[PDB]
């Protein structure tokens, strides 16, 4: 973040979508929720129909309980690409945000079926399974989540 402040010009910082994504993810890692949202909204302003990694935005907006923004993003992301696992994981995150979670588990498993090498869908499944009060399924899902990404 200090390098962004010093070694990155403002015009490049506030225009480059990759800078917006990286800065939002970084401020997520420092658990700075307010900072990340007003730059991810700018990123959506640059292009609404971009996927890359909305897992981060879905995770943020689940905490912020913004149902309408999540609904709009899920609708747009599915309408753009149906086969991308990120769209399905965002939809499942919204579903877990609402209330019901069995269909969220099924949607997450479908997203993992689209791309078996997506570790974040696996870890999101494991995190959700805690809400189901089930551990053995959760523990197996966690281990298979670690298998995909060694340093998670």
């Amino acid at each position: 973040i200090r390098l962004f402040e010093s070694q990155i010009p403002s015009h490049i910082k506030d225009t480059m979508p990759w800078c917006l994504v990286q800065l939002g993810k970084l401020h997520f890692e420092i658990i700075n929720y307010d900072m990340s949202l007003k730059y991810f909204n700018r990123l959506k302003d640059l292009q609404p129909a971009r996927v890359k990694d909305m897992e981060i935005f879905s995770t943020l907006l689940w905490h912020l309980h913004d149902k309408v923004k999540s609904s709009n993003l899920a609708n747009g992301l599915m309408d753009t690409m149906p086969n991308k696992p990120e769209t399905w994981c965002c939809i499942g995150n919204l579903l877990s945000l609402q209330k019901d979670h069995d269909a969220a588990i099924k949607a997450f498993e479908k997203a993992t079926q689209l791309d078996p090498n997506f570790a974040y869908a696996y870890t999101l499944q494991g995190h959700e399974h805690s809400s189901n009060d089930s551990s053995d399924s959760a523990k197996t899902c966690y281990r298979k989540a670690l298998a995909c990404d060694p340093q998670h």
Binding site: T59, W62, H63, L124, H127
Partner: peptide
């Protein structure tokens, strides 16, 4: 058990049945 139905019926349906029992984070 359902030994007999109304008006001298033969078989029986069951529309619904349920059983009831009692008992910060990073996503």
């Amino acid at each position: 058990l359902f030994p007999v139905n109304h008006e001298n019926g033969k078989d029986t349906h069951l529309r619904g049945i349920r059983l009831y029992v009692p008992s910060a984070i990073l996503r």
